[PDB]
Design a protein around this ligand. Structure first.
Ligand SMILES: [Mg+2]
Ligand SMILES: [Mg+2]
Ligand SMILES: [Mg+2]
Ligand SMILES: [Mg+2]
Ligand SMILES: [Mg+2]
Ligand SMILES: [Mg+2]
Ligand SMILES: [Mg+2]
Ligand SMILES: [Mg+2]
Ligand SMILES: [Mg+2]
Ligand SMILES: [Mg+2]
Ligand SMILES: [Mg+2]
Ligand SMILES: [Mg+2]
Ligand SMILES: [Mg+2]
Ligand SMILES: [Mg+2]
Ligand SMILES: [Mg+2]
Ligand SMILES: [Mg+2]
Ligand SMILES: [Mg+2]
Ligand SMILES: [Mg+2]
Ligand SMILES: [Mg+2]
Ligand SMILES: [Mg+2]
Ligand SMILES: [Mg+2]
Ligand SMILES: [Mg+2]
Ligand SMILES: [Mg+2]
Ligand SMILES: [Mg+2]
Ligand SMILES: [Mg+2]
Ligand SMILES: [Mg+2]
Ligand SMILES: [Mg+2]
Ligand SMILES: [Mg+2]
Ligand SMILES: [Mg+2]
Ligand SMILES: [Mg+2]
Ligand SMILES: [Mg+2]
Ligand SMILES: [Mg+2]
Ligand SMILES: [Mg+2]
Ligand SMILES: [Mg+2]
Ligand SMILES: [Mg+2]
Ligand SMILES: [Mg+2]
Ligand SMILES: [Mg+2]
Ligand SMILES: [Mg+2]
Ligand SMILES: [Mg+2]
Ligand SMILES: [Mg+2]
Ligand SMILES: [Mg+2]
Ligand SMILES: [Mg+2]
Ligand SMILES: [Mg+2]
Ligand SMILES: [Mg+2]
Ligand SMILES: [Mg+2]
Lengths: 125, 155, 188, 260
RNA sequence: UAUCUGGUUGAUCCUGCCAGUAGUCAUAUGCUUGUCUCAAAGAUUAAGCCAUGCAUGUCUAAGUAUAAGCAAUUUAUACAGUGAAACUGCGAAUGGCUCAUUAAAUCAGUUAUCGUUUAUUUGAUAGUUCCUUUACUACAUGGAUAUCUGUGGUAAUUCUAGAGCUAAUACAUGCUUAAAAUCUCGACCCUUUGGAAGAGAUGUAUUUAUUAGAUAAAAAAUCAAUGUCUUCGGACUCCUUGAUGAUUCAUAAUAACUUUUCGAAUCGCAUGGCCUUGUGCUGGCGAUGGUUCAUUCAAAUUUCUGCCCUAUCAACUUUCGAUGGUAGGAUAGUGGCCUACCAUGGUUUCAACGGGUAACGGGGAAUAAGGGUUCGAUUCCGGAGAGGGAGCCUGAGAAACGGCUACCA
RNA sequence: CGGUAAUUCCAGCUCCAGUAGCGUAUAUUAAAGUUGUUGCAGUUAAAAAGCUCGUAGUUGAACUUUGGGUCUGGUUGUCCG
RNA sequence: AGGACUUUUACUUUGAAAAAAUUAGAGUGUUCAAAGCAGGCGAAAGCUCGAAUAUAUUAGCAUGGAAUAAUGGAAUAGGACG
RNA sequence: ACCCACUCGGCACCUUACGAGAAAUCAAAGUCUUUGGGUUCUGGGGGGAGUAUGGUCGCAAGGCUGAAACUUAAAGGAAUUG
RNA sequence: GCCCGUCGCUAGUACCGAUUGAAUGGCUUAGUGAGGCCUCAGGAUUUGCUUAGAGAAGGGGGCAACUCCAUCUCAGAGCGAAGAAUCUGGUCAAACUUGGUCAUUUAGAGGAACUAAAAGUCGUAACAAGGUUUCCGUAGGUGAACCUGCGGAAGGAUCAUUA
C-alpha cells in the first residue's frame, strides 16, 4: 500500500477509423513533418481538444468573472509562451481557432528544420 | 389515559432525592422539583403545579433535552405515556428533478403535563435513549386542536 | 456471555435481524448478585477499565439514614418484607435495591434517648440546657413510635448491593411509610 | 479495530503537513499530547520538512535526543511530539526561536520570532471550572490547567502564559471590535476584527470577522482565537498578516515583486 | 469527447431489430516484441486445503547481577566496566490480508454523550497513614520466588516434578508530621444577653441520606421566637455564591459507612552550602512511580436523510419481548439489554414483512453535448473475519485466534 | 462467395490500416430519441383495460400594495482633465 | 441583553461544512511527456517564491428574499386594543 | 305545423392544407427537435407463447396474473409498377 | 406463384413425471448436552499468631522462671490467611440423537411438447369472390389442415336508391 501516481492516456483514436479524406489528411501531415506514426496526430488533436474544451468552458462563463479572467489569461500566456498562438490574437476566441498544424509547427523537429541546421525534416528527426 | 391516583403501581412514585420534611409544620402539598429545558421553551403550568411524577419528564424528570428539535404531527396517541409522530417530507430524486412524498414515524414520550390527541402538531426535542425506540420528549403542543377551537354554533 | 446488545432484538418494525457480528466484550452482562442475609461475603469483580466492583451477596448489616433529623447509623438488616418488583425475592429473602426490610432499630433508639430522652415505647447541666433549648420539638409522628415500641424499624434500601457492595438505605418515614403500610396491609 | 490505532498512512495525514504523496507509505502519527493530531504538527515534520535541518528519521532522532529542541521551555525528546498552534520551539544552537502560526494559505509556516517575546505564549481559554476543595481553575487549548485564575476570566477568552512559571500574566476579554485569528476551516490563517457574534441559542456560535482589507467572512466560535486589540496585536503576526489576497492578486504580487 | 453505415422489397417510404463502429485503471487469450520511465498482479471458480522457512519481542547513566560469562586495566573491599539467562515493566488488540456473513444492516454527510470507560502523552494535583500522641524500625520491615547449582521422568512438545541457596519499582507490611479552623460532648458559676476550664473526630478514596449551590424591583405593621451593640431610644445597617440553552451540574457542608484505595521503605548523575567540624545539618538536576481533575490518542453507543431487484412476497411482530409503563438486576453508562407485574401495542400500498443479490458501504472508475448507464473484491476511510461455531483469562483496550477451552469438519 | 474464368476459399504478387503493437471472446458504455425526466411510441407496424364508479397517488380557477416624487451609495458606457 | 409574542413550510441567494488521493486547474524545461511538488537566484559570499484554486449538485446548520405552491386566523365572536 | 336569422349541446358530413404523418389518411391522428395543460393503462424484433409453472376466481367450461431455456435475420406497416 | 396442418426421420432445448427417491443446507418440535463463567459447598497443602510440654545443656551475654535464647522440636488445640482436586445450582450455550418443515441441486420408468433440418406421406385450409368471403368469441365434431351452430367485426368483394 503506497499512494499511486496517476498514469493517464494522452491520445484518442477517432471513432470513424476509415475515413478516406481524413486518412489522406493524416498522411499529408505525417509526410510534411516526418511523423513516425499517426498516433502523433492523434496526440496533437487530443491536446488541442483539451485546450478547446477549456476555452469553451471559460467562454460560457460570464465576461469579467474571476474564473474567466484568471484561467483564461493563464491559458493565453501559456499558449503564447509555447508560441503556437501569435501575440496579435491573445483574445481567448482565437484559441478556439487554432489548428493541429499549429502545434505541429512548434515541434523541435520542425524548428530544427526551420533554423536550417538540418536540411530535411527527416534529417531533423 | 392518566390514573386518578398519583401513584397507582406497586412501587412508590417519588422524584428521587427531593425530600419533604414531615417533622416540619409547613404542611404544604409536597416539595416538587422542576426545571426549564431552555431554548425559550415555556414550562407548562400543568407541570409547574401538577402532581404526576413521570421519571422521563423534560420539565420534572431527570431527562435533559439536547440535540435535534423536530416538528411533526401526532399520528398515534393511544399507547401509554408515549406518542407516535408522523414526520412528512419530500425526497428529491435528481434523475427526474422531481420530489417524492415520504413519511417517517418517530416515537416519543409525551409528559402527562401535555394533553395530546390524534392530529395535534407537536414540537419535540432530542434526549437520551428512553426506550428501545423513543428518543424524543414532547416539548410543545403547538396546535391543541387546529380546527376544533370553535366547536358549537349558537347565534 | 450474556449480551445486552440491541442486535438480537427484532427491529421496531418487527423484522428478524440477521446476525451482523459475533457479540463483543464491551457488551457483556454478568450474573445477578441476588444477595442474601448473614455472614458478610463480598466478592470483588474486575470490570472494564479496572474500577473494582463489589458483589454483596450474603450481607447482614449496613448504614441507614433518618431524613427528618438527618442522622445515619450502622444497623442490622433483619429480613425483607416487601419488594416492588418480585415477591419471589421477598419469599427467598433476596436483598436488592428499593427492597423493604426491617431494622434492629436499637442504635436509633438510644441515639434518640441521648439526644432528646423521651422514653419511647410508652444529669449534667449542659445536657439539660440543650434539652430545654430543644423545647420538646421532637414531635416525630406516631407510626415510627409504634414500630419503635415493636422494636423493628421499616427501612427501604437505596444502595445497590449488586454494584456498590454496600447495604445503605433510609427509613420509611412520612407519607412514604404510610403508603407502604397500606401495601403491607394488603399483604396482611 | 479493537483498541487504539497507532499508524498514520501518508495519504491520511492532514493536507497541512502537506508532505510528499510518494517516497513513503506512512506518515508520522503524532503521539498523545497538548493538541489534536489533526490540528497539531509533529516535531519530525517541523524539522525534517519545514526547516530541512535534518535529512531523515535518524537525524531528527539525534537532534531531539541531545536536548536542543525546547517546546515551550521544555525539552520534549520524542520524535512525534504534537507541537501545536502558538507553541514556541527554541533551538539554543543557532539561538533561534519559532512560534507556530498559520500562514494564510492555512499552513504551519516557519516564523522566526524574537527571543525577548519568546519568553511568553498566548492561549485560548476552553474551560473555566471549579476543581476539588473549591479551587477555581482554567483549561486552555493546550490542555494547560492554570490554577487560581483571575475571577472574571471566562470561556473563549484569551490569556498570556508567561511560559516560565506557567502562570497567568495578562488576559484579553472576548467581545466585539477585537483583533482575532482563525484556526480551522477555509479561513485558516485569516486575521481580522470581530464585528458581530450571533448567539444561536442551542449551540454552535458564529462570529463575523472583518479584516484590514475590509473583507468580511463568518466563522465558528470554536474556530476563533482572540489575538489582541486592532492595530496592537499581542504577538508578531507572520508575513502578510493573513489578508488572504485573491488568486489574481497573488498573481499580481508574483508579477510586480519580481527580481532575478 | 452533440456525426452514423450494410441487411426484409422487382423497386420505395417506415417501424424495427441483427450486424458494423469507438471505447473500457475489464479481464482472459492468440500472434509478434528492440529501448527509457512507471506499474497492476491467485479478487471472480474454492472465506477450498497446506508441507517448509520466516512474519513481535523488547535495557537506558537510571528496577533486579555472584553467568563459578567476558575485563582486569588505571579509576574498583557491597556495587560500579561489558554483559548471556531469568524475574520485573511494556507491546503483543498496531500493522498485514480477505470480502464470507450483512439490504436501515454497514457506510456517507450531519448531530449528541447534562448517558459513559479511557494505559499512555501533556498540565496541575495530597502535610492528617498519630487515634488518646507520657514507651515505635524509619539511619530502612518480612517471607517466598525465578535465573543458577545438581537429581530425574517421557519417544517425543517453547512438557518440567523433587532438593538447595538468592534478590526487587515483583509479593506483602509499615513509619513519620506541623499549625490552624469547624464540629460535636462538659469540672463549674449566676441569676440571664446565660457563658465558659476543658475532652474526641474531621485528608483523600467508597456508599447512602440531607443541605447550600441565590438573584424582576421601593417600603411596612404586627404578633411568635430571640440574637449583636447599647452613647438603655431601641437600630439591625452587613450578609457570599461559578458555568451552560437547560440540570439533582461544577463545587462545598452535615450525619454516618467501608471484609479501609491512595497519601514514594524506589533508582541515576552531581555530590554544593552551613559550620551547631559530625557523618552532623541541609542541599540541585533528573528517571520511574502515584490519587484526583483536566487534555490527547480514542472506544462505546446516538439524532435526521440517503440504499440494488422482486407482489409468481400483502399483511408482518407478540405465548419464547413483539410496542410501551414501573421497579429491580446487569452494564462503564442510557436503553426490553434481562427479569417480575401490568397495558395491548409497533410497522405497512409513501411497499412494511418475506425472497434474491455471481452485494461489503463509501471516497471513486469507465463512459460523456446536456440528462445519464454500468462498475467500485483492491493502494485512503469505515465494518466484519481468521476452517464453522460458541466460551473465556490477562489489560486501559480482545469475545484476540502468529492467546487459551470445548464441539463439529 | 464457392455448382470450370471465385476481385470473398488455399497460395504467390501488389496494396491498405494500426504499428511494437495488432487480432480475437465475454462483459459494458456511446451509438440507443431501441428505457426516452430533458426525450420514445399506442388507428392500421408491438401496444388504449369492454365500460363506469372509487380509496390511496398525481394534479387542481381567480382574488388580497400597484403605483408614484425626492434624496442618496456603488458599477458601467459616456465628454474631456 | 434581557422578559415578551413568535403561523408553519416548500422554494431560492450567500456562508460555514462535505478528510486526503482522484477530477478540474495555477506555477514549475522531470531533457518532452506520463508524472513529481518541486525548485529559482547570488559574485558564489546564503537569499529566496512555492506546495495555487473549484466542484460536488441529496440530508443537516446559519443567512437575505417573499414572486410561485400549500396551511392558519374573527362567524357561537370564547375576536383585537385601552 | 312550417319559413327566415341566431345560440347552446349531440351523432355526423363536404372541401382544403395553410398543419401532422412512413404513407392510407386525420379538422383531430393539429397546436411535437420552435420538443413540458393534468392524468391512467400498455409496447421494446419475430417465434417459442398468452405455453409451462405458481397463485387466484369458477361446479365445470375457462377467466385474471404470466416467463425462461432455445431458435431466428427478419417478421411486419403503407403505398408504386407488373 | 405462396403456403397450411396430421403422420414419418435426425439433433437440440425445456416441461410434467410414478419412483412415495438421493444429497446438501436452512430452520425447528422432543430428548441429551462438552467447556468456560458465576454461585453453594468442600479443604489436599502452604503458611502466621499463640506457651502447648521435651530432650537443647550459659541452645539469653551470669549452676536457677536460659539473668529462656528470631530456644532444638513434634501430640499440641484454637485462632486466622492463602488455598488445588472435587463438587451444588444456574448461565452462556457449541454440538449429538430423533423426527417435522422448507429451499437448492439431484437422478428417474414413462408422457406431452417446441424448435431446426424440408426432396417423405395424406389432403389443399389461407393469399383472387382461394373457387363455401375472411377473421373474433364460444360450443360441438372429425385422419389432418378444418367444418358447423349462435352472436359480432370489414382488416370486404358495397362508403351509393330521394331508383
Ligand atoms: Mg488493522
Ligand atoms: Mg445521445
Ligand atoms: Mg415484408
Ligand atoms: Mg433483394
Ligand atoms: Mg452491436
Ligand atoms: Mg542505453
Ligand atoms: Mg479467491
Ligand atoms: Mg517480557
Ligand atoms: Mg550497564
Ligand atoms: Mg433482505
Ligand atoms: Mg439541593
Ligand atoms: Mg453531583
Ligand atoms: Mg431502568
Ligand atoms: Mg458495492
Ligand atoms: Mg458475498
Ligand atoms: Mg470496495
Ligand atoms: Mg466476492
Ligand atoms: Mg481496509
Ligand atoms: Mg477479530
Ligand atoms: Mg482457509
Ligand atoms: Mg497493558
Ligand atoms: Mg475468535
Ligand atoms: Mg496465521
Ligand atoms: Mg492478528
Ligand atoms: Mg496461546
Ligand atoms: Mg482465380
Ligand atoms: Mg420505439
Ligand atoms: Mg395485423
Ligand atoms: Mg397492432
Ligand atoms: Mg380502449
Ligand atoms: Mg384520491
Ligand atoms: Mg392557483
Ligand atoms: Mg476530497
Ligand atoms: Mg491532471
Ligand atoms: Mg419480443
Ligand atoms: Mg403473440
Ligand atoms: Mg393454474
Ligand atoms: Mg401490405
Ligand atoms: Mg429431436
Ligand atoms: Mg456444574
Ligand atoms: Mg393427394
Ligand atoms: Mg383452399
Ligand atoms: Mg374460403
Ligand atoms: Mg364452391
Ligand atoms: Mg372447395
Amino acid at each position: 500500500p503506497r499512494a499511486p501516481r496517476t498514469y493517464s492516456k494522452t491520445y484518442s483514436t477517432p471513432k470513424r477509423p476509415y475515413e478516406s479524406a481524413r486518412l489522406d489528411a493524416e498522411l499529408k501531415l505525417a509526410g510534411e513533418y516526418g511523423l513516425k506514426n499517426k498516433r502523433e496526430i492523434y496526440r496533437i488533436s487530443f491536446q488541442l481538444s483539451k485546450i478547446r474544451r477549456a476555452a469553451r468552458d471559460l467562454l460560457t462563463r460570464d465576461e469579467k468573472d474571476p474564473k474567466r479572467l484568471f484561467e483564461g489569461n493563464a491559458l493565453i500566456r501559456r499558449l503564447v509562451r509555447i508560441g503556437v498562438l501569435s501575440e496579435d490574437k491573445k483574445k481567448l476566441d482565437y484559441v478556439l481557432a487554432l489548428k493541429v498544424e499549429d502545434f505541429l509547427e512548434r515541434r523541435l523537429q520542425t524548428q530544427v528544420y526551420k533554423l536550417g541546421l538540418a536540411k530535411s525534416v527527416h534529417h531533423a528527426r | 389515559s392518566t390514573e386518578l391516583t398519583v401513584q397507582s403501581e406497586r412501587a412508590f412514585q417519588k422524584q428521587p432525592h427531593i425530600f419533604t420534611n414531615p417533622k416540619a409544620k409547613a404542611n404544604r402539598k409536597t416539595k416538587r422539583w422542576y426545571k426549564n429545558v431552555g431554548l425559550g421553551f415555556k414550562t407548562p403550568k400543568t407541570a409547574i403545579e401538577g402532581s404526576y411524577i413521570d421519571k422521563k419528564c423534560p420539565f420534572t424528570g431527570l431527562v435533559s433535552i439536547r440535540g435535534k428539535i423536530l416538528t411533526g404531527t401526532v399520528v398515534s396517541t393511544r399507547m401509554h405515556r408515549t406518542i407516535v409522530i408522523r414526520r412528512d417530507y419530500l425526497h428529491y430524486v435528481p434523475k427526474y428533478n422531481r420530489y417524492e412524498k415520504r413519511h417517517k414515524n418517530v416515537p416519543a414520550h409525551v409528559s402527562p403535563a401535555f394533553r395530546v390527541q390524534v392530529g395535534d402538531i407537536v414540537t419535540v426535542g432530542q434526549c437520551r435513549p428512553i426506550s428501545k425506540t423513543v428518543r424524543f420528549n414532547v416539548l410543545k403542543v403547538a396546535s391543541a386542536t387546529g380546527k376544533a377551537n370553535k366547536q358549537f354554533a349558537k347565534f | 456471555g450474556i449480551s445486552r446488545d440491541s442486535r438480537h432484538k427484532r427491529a421496531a418494525t418487527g423484522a428478524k435481524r440477521a446476525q451482523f457480528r459475533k457479540k463483543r466484550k464491551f457488551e457483556l452482562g454478568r450474573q445477578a448478585a441476588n444477595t442474601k442475609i448473614g455472614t458478610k461475603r463480598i466478592h470483588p469483580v474486575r470490570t472494564r477499565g479496572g474500577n473494582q466492583k463489589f458483589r454483596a451477596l450474603r450481607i447482614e448489616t449496613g448504614n441507614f439514614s433518618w431524613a427528618s433529623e438527618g442522622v445515619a447509623r450502622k444497623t442490622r438488616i433483619t429480613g425483607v418484607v416487601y419488594h416492588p418488583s418480585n415477591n419471589e425475592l421477598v419469599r427467598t429473602n433476596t436483598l436488592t435495591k428499593a427492597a423493604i426490610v426491617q431494622i434492629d432499630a436499637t442504635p436509633f433508639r438510644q441515639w434518640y434517648e441521648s439526644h432528646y430522652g423521651q422514653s419511647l415505647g410508652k444529669t449534667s447541666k449542659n445536657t439539660e440546657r440543650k434539652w430545654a433549648a430543644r423545647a420538646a420539638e421532637a414531635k416525630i409522628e406516631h407510626a415510627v413510635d409504634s414500630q419503635f415500641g415493636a422494636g423493628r424499624l421499616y427501612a427501604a434500601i437505596s444502595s445497590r448491593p449488586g454494584q456498590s457492595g454496600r447495604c445503605d438505605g433510609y427509613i420509611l418515614e412520612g407519607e412514604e411509610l404510610a403508603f407502604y403500610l397500606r401495601r403491607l396491609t394488603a399483604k396482611k | 479495530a479493537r483498541g487504539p490505532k497507532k499508524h498514520l498512512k501518508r495519504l491520511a495525514a492532514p493536507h497541512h503537513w502537506m508532505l510528499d504523496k510518494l517516497s513513503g507509505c506512512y506518515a508520522p502519527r503524532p503521539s498523545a499530547g497538548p493538541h489534536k493530531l489533526r490540528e497539531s504538527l509533529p516535531l519530525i515534520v517541523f524539522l525534517r520538512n519545514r526547516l530541512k535541518y535534518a535529512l531523515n528519521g535518524r537525524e531528527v532522532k539525534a537532534i531531539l535526543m541531545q536536548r536542543h529542541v525546547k517546546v515551550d521551555g521544555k525539552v520534549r525528546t520524542d520524535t512525534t511530539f504534537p507541537a501545536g498552534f502558538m507553541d514556541v520551539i527554541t533551538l539554543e544552537a543557532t539561538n533561534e526561536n519559532f512560534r507556530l502560526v498559520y500562514d494564510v494559505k492555512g499552513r504551519f509556516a516557519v516564523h522566526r520570532i524574537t527571543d525577548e517575546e519568546a519568553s511568553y505564549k498566548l492561549a485560548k481559554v476552553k474551560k473555566v471550572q471549579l476543581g476539588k476543595k473549591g479551587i477555581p481553575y482554567v483549561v486552555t487549548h493546550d490542555g494547560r490547567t492554570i490554577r487560581y485564575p483571575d475571577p472574571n476570566i471566562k470561556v473563549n477568552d484569551t490569556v498570556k502564559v508567561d511560559l516560565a512559571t506557567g502562570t497567568i500574566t495578562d488576559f484579553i476579554k472576548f467581545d466585539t471590535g477585537k483583533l482575532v485569528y482563525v484556526t480551522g476551516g477555509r479561513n485558516l490563517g485569516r486575521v481580522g476584527t470581530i464585528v458581530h457574534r450571533e448567539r444561536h441559542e442551542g449551540g454552535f456560535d458564529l462570529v463575523h470577522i472583518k479584516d484590514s482589507l475590509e473583507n468580511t467572512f463568518v466563522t465558528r466560535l470554536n474556530n476563533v482565537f482572540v489575538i489582541g486589540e486592532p492595530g496592537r496585536p499581542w504577538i508578531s503576526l507572520p508575513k502578510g498578516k493573513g489578508i488572504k489576497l485573491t488568486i489574481s492578486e497573488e498573481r499580481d504580487r508574483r508579477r510586480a515583486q519580481h527580481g532575478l
